[PDB]
Design a protein around this ligand. Sequence first.
Ligand SMILES: Cn1c(CNc2ccc(C(=N)N)cc2)nc2cc(C(=O)N(CCC(=O)O)c3ccccn3)ccc21
Lengths: 219, 214
Amino acid sequence: DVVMTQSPLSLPVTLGQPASISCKSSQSLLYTDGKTYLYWFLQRPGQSPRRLIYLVSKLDSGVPDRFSGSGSGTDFTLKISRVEAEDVGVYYCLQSTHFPHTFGGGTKVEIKRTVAAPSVFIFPPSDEQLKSGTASVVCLLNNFYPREAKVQWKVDNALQSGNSQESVTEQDSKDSTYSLSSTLTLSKADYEKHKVYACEVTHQGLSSPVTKSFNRGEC
Amino acid sequence: VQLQESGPGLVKPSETLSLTCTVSTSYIVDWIRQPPGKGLEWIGVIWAGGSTGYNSALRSRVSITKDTSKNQFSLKLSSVTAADTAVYYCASAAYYSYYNYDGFAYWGQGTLVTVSSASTKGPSVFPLAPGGTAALGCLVKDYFPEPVTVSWNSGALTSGVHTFPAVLQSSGLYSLSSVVTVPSSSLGTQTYICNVNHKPSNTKVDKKVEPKSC
Ligand SMILES: Cn1c(CNc2ccc(C(=N)N)cc2)nc2cc(C(=O)N(CCC(=O)O)c3ccccn3)ccc21
């Protein structure tokens, strides 16, 4: 099988600057009809891959002229003349000159924007959930940059471990930020044994860590 | 060119995965898959005229066929295991002639297929109740398989919405949160409802989100 080596894996770029993505094939991609079946796609978060380029350098209808493709034989490049916020996502090269057809590993373009502190919000479990025997406590970190953030759960000032899960959004196509949700899960019995529920957030945008808290039962 | 993709989103291990792709010339149709959080893998092709080509990595478990009269294409993958869990895509391109054909020009919306012996389970929806900005949301808990879709105010509220990737709990059920930031001044006047849809269990839940009563 033809190995398609794509580089870099991660591509942080300043808004308005050019970008270059390399795709190197282990075999010539020149077919017997004189055509080179090398394609490029952009996969935006939660969307299907969308074709940008085909036949190395041909732009699909509707694709902005900021995108261009070049190369021959084994070394190919996708260039973006001036990166825009909506260009974030994962770019893939593909060869179909040889069977089986093979894709590059992908390149994730990230906008390197200014530091943005997260806005922190805490949510107690609903009375509806408490009736079912479980308590989910949610901490939200909204619209921050860079991605690096730490969430620490405290219950009556005791550090929690192994009872939380978190997930992070992909970089926003408009404001270039991330958001994160952390859920602390306890049994109703364990939840009722304690008073102070707190979420402590550490991030570059915060001069000192931010703690959001509530006292169980208070409206 | 529009591509409609259909098929079960849950398949038991050892059973056959079946997907359908309808194109609305002639066409060349390719199938591609993407395991969660990973890259793209090419599965196979059906050429204009019916010739096929498959990825040897599928160890001859794969079949692609075209309906005799319509541009409808079927993907069959036998003896599935958890390694076959992925979003499956069909992609088409024009076949003008033997000297002018293309590939991967138009892609369908993907179909997630989860290979599991577990039963479908609808979610429970709980409110995440709230100067100058307020946050609110919905916790969509204990469902299987993925995905769930969440909208706010029947699609009228899109700005400031963040629907997080689901997490798999130790119970083997998924949990997801959807949040929205709004002006704190809007809380007394504007109604906020999260619309949750879980197609595998045919569950549709509308949850009004408001502060807890004092
Ligand atoms: C490697 N390769 C290319 C490179 N370009 C290319 C563009 C796009 C795509 C793509 N869309 N996947 C795939 C490749 N073109 C090819 C045409 C044939 C072919 O004509 N036969 C016979 C067709 C019949 O007998 O009628 C065929 C076709 C499919 C399978 C098996 N055999 C074989 C191999 C080819």
